[PDB]
Design a protein around this ligand. Structure first.
Ligand SMILES: CCCCCCCCCCCCCCCC(=O)O
Ligand SMILES: CCCCCCCCCCCCCCCC(=O)O
Lengths: 211, 211
């Protein structure tokens, strides 16, 4: 494999020789872009269930860096783009759980793709694409003295994709009822908590000093 | 991890010394069972999208072997059970795709759990549990000269669980729009096909010679 990661959640994408894209760069709709690493803002709302203890909803803000493969075509209708999520930092705060910092698990390749869906029956603009990303994350919860991780990838989706990157777009975590979160120090143990829902919005390109 | 597999989709469960359970063994509702390996029938209906070629719906029949951990309690309400899917074989056939045989990917630990949901549905009541399994599979398609595998786990769920095992129960694959299926001989390549939907039914205990 082209990846050194121990667990791959999708297709590896090269970053060497791929330029970073920052604020100032246009987002042109319906246009397959040249390969780049998108430096993008993001916010989310995450709900966590702690068995026998409680359920907590936490708002997060931060950024992601996502490398894109070259498009498989210069024509939008045929174009596919493969992505890797290569760096993240999101922060949120909560009285009960403290300050939570979400980053990537270095043992996992977080990977996704953008392509025409097989079920274009959702009211999306004509020709719009579907974006997905499968993520291995770390949830640092210092107030609880814990760091948590997921073995099952968190599936994050953006529908009605009319530009790449889909700046400004709303997305969802596809979690059916519960997603186990494991103590990094006891990953073969019982889950410590469950992520029960996640919604997010993409922002736009950031300046380097905003990260 | 105590599991030697390179990709872990959940919690490992002990199999050594755990007896097999076969037809004849009763399934009494509301009763956490002693640890065992359930030998169960199963059927499913799977839809596959092959880009630029077609979409095909195929019915499968076969069996699964699922090991259960000891229950965390002898009282149903408190009981949780952890599971691993340790062996399977399902077969279906389709003119365009040929005979398809589904087995486990030996590199992946397929793992799940049964516990009370945090969000019980109106038709579940406060006593029913929810069952989930995260699966790494192989799809053998000799007609096409290919074997395919998934990197994102196939999330298989059963709601309104009132017995363990949930013999006879309907279940669903929680696949959002598309699940990439990769050539085992080109696993970092573009997907060959996508699993776009899956539903299944659990059968009951099988005789040893029915597998
Ligand atoms: C545990 C919470 C994780 C949230 C992390 C956000 C996931 C990434 C956002 C959705 C996919 C991003 C797609 C951008 C693709 C592109 O750069 O063109
Ligand atoms: C293409 C993938 C097909 C996979 C088919 C799913 C196999 C059945 C697993 C569903 C959960 C099993 C629950 C049984 C639990 C128990 O033994 O008590």
């Amino acid at each position: 494999s082209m990846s050194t990661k121990s667990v791959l959640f999708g297709r590896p994408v090269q970053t060497e020789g791929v330029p970073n894209v920052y604020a100032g760069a246009p987002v042109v709709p319906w246009t397959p872009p040249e390969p780049g690493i998108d430096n993008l803002g993001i916010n989310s709302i995450d709900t966590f269930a702690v068995p026998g203890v409680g359920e907590y909803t936490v708002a997060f803000d931060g950024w992601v860096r996502v490398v894109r493969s070259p498009s498989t075509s210069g024509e939008w209708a045929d174009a596919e783009v493969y992505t890797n999520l290569i760096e993240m930092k999101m922060v949120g705060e909560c009285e009960e759980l403290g300050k939570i910092t979400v980053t990537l698990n270095p043992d996992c390749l977080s990977a996704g793709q953008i392509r025409t869906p097989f079920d274009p029956y959702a009211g999306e603009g004509p020709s719009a694409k579907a974006c997905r990303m499968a993520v291995g994350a770390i949830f640092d919860m210092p107030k609880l003295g814990l760091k948590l991780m997921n073995r099952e990838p968190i599936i994050l989706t953006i529908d009605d994709v009319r530009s790449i990157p889909p700046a400004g777009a709303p997305g969802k975590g596809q979690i059916y009822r519960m997603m186990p979160l494991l103590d990094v120090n006891d990953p073969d143990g019982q889950p410590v908590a469950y992520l029960t829902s996640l919604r997010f919005n993409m922002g736009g390109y950031l300046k380097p000093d905003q990260m």
